[PDB]
């Protein structure tokens, strides 16, 4: 019923710098008792959400005073005076004023750091995998910033499409970098029909794209 919308969807903040996250309710969210039950939750990956703010502006037990809440009518704001590395995750606003209770779509807080080019590594399929009739070729892009990156697979200089899948880790807790794994999946028979296997990497940290390759059976 009551739609909760968050602005921004994501943001990257330098530790020590402020962060501001807004939430808008589609209609007023004043409960029958006269209270506005607007809550802010922080959810870290592989964890359940943790309550930070309730009733617009009150801090829940154990919440640091760098987190504050404000708002009236249909506009609410969560502020972090000075972001810490521990503040990363998805922030959600939530209204428990009018049934059905609804959450915002979330705001992902990320750590802003300096640009870092990825270290690129290519892995041919193992001989054990080949015995089973499939060949998985893996391209690794290690410890880069920002996340934006392009991986292109080439089999004997021919561009591959529809036969690869990629995965990105969450920001590293120590260096605030990302890593990307790209897997090219071919049959043993198709893999044996070709020689050159390459993944071309495009990233901001690199002046020009980096190509990592190998020749089958070397």
């Amino acid at each position: 019923d009551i739609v909760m919308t968050q602005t921004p969807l994501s943001l990257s903040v330098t530790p020590g710098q402020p962060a501001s996250i807004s939430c808008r309710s589609s209609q007023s969210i004043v409960h029958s008792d006269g209270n506005i039950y607007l809550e802010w939750y922080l959810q870290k990956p592989g964890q359940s959400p943790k309550l930070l703010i309730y009733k617009v502006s009150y801090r829940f037990s154990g919440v640091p005073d760098r987190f504050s809440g404000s708002g009236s009518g249909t506009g609410f704001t969560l502020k972090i005076s000075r972001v810490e590395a521990e503040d990363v995750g998805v922030y959600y606003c939530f209204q428990a004023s009018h049934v059905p209770y609804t959450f915002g779509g979330g705001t992902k807080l990320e750590i802003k750091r300096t640009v870092a080019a990825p270290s690129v590594f290519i892995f041919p399929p193992s001989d054990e995998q080949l015995k089973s009739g499939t060949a998985s070729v893996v391209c690794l892009l290690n410890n880069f910033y920002p996340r934006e990156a392009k991986v292109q697979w080439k089999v004997d200089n021919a561009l591959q499409s529809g036969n690869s899948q990629e995965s990105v880790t969450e920001q590293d807790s120590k260096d605030s970098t990302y890593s990307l794994s790209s897997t090219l999946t071919l049959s043993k028979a198709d893999y044996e029909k070709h020689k050159v296997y390459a993944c071309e990497v495009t990233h901001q940290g690199l002046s020009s794209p980096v190509t990592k390759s190998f020749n089958r059976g070397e």
Partner: protein, 220 residues
């Protein structure tokens, strides 16, 4: 100390039903409202309903009308969430959560229950090495890993050298393949001078299939 103990992860075929339990303890059951909240992997939070622990009445999110049945058992201090006519879209972690303040917002959460809705059968992974080489070196630093292929359902955990190796480890989120089976990789960067000296073994644990694979990654 307040506790909410949920029933184990479930694999369901489309069209089937699931009943998740949430055992409450360490507090007076009738003091705090009980809620059911779900989250599909990589998606947002979805409030399902709020159960009154005293009168047993549930206020539902109308999206779940005729599909979800949320109850409480006063005698066992247990809340239940039943979801029928399960579809691919119902694959999610289901949480029970209470409001220890006495109000309608919640703060204490159960561990969650992964419910996977798929036609796929439970299957342990194949573990293949991502051997280090010269094509995997970067100035005294080499990369190596394990390719954890064709398993169902989630989750899998990967450790290196029984947990003795944690620095430089990157375990990637799984990808769901067209076959309905999951695949993931776990990598680690180590000094290339340790390749002849140090043994590197990825320990792959797939609790849903009762599989435990230890794979030595040998240099090339």
């Amino acid at each position: 100390q307040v506790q909410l103990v949920q029933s184990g992860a479930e694999v369901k075929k489309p069209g089937a039903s699931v009943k998740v339990s949430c055992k409450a303890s360490g507090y007076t059951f009738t003091d705090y409202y009980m809620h059911w909240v779900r989250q599909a992997p990589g998606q947002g939070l979805e409030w399902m309903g709020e159960t009154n622990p005293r009168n047993g009445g549930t206020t539902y999110n109308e999206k779940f009308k005729g599909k979800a049945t949320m109850t409480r058992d006063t005698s066992t201090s247990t809340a239940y969430m039943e979801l029928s006519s399960l579809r691919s879209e119902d694959t999610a972690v289901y949480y029970c959560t209470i409001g220890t303040s006495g109000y309608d917002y919640f703060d204490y959460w159960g561990q969650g229950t992964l419910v996977t809705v798929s036609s796929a059968s439970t299957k342990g992974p194949s573990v293949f090495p991502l051997a280090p080489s010269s094509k995997s070196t970067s100035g005294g630093t080499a990369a190596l890993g394990c390719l954890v292929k064709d398993y169902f359902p989630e989750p899998v955990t990967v450790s290196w050298n029984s947990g003795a190796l944690t620095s430089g480890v990157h375990t990637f989120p799984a990808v769901l393949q067209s076959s309905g089976l999951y695949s993931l990789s776990s990598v680690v960067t180590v000094p290339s001078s340790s390749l002849g000296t140090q043994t590197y073994i990825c320990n792959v644990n797939h609790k849903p299939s009762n599989t435990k694979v230890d794979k030595k990654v040998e240099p090339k």
